[PDB]
């Protein structure tokens, strides 16, 4: 009952699973948007390069 944050390999496995799905979702999906290609960001070249 006392020690879960303290050294406990099983508790880390839980945090690893949480981190795994969180990183997949947020990191990959949200960050491949922003700056894939060669022009600007996600503007689509509306105002400039019309």
């Amino acid at each position: 009952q006392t020690g879960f944050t303290t050294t406990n390999e099983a508790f880390q496995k839980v945090q690893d699973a949480v981190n795994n799905n969180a990183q997949a979702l947020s990191k990959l999906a949200s960050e491949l948007s922003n700056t894939f290609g060669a022009i600007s960001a996600s503007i689509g070249d509306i105002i400039q390069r019309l």
Binding site: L25, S26, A29, S30, S33
Partner: protein, 42 residues
């Protein structure tokens, strides 16, 4: 609403996180019933 009062799901990428199919109370009911049956089933 919590994205109003400032989460990327609603804000930009279309991605949505689906609900778990079981609320915490139902899962807790399952594990509680198992705990109740521990002594007798064995």
């Amino acid at each position: 609403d919590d994205c109003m009062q400032q989460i990327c799901a609603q804000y930009v990428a279309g991605y949505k996180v689906l609900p778990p199919l079981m609320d915490v109370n139902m899962e807790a009911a399952y594990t509680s019933s198992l705990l109740g049956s521990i002594a007798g089933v064995g």
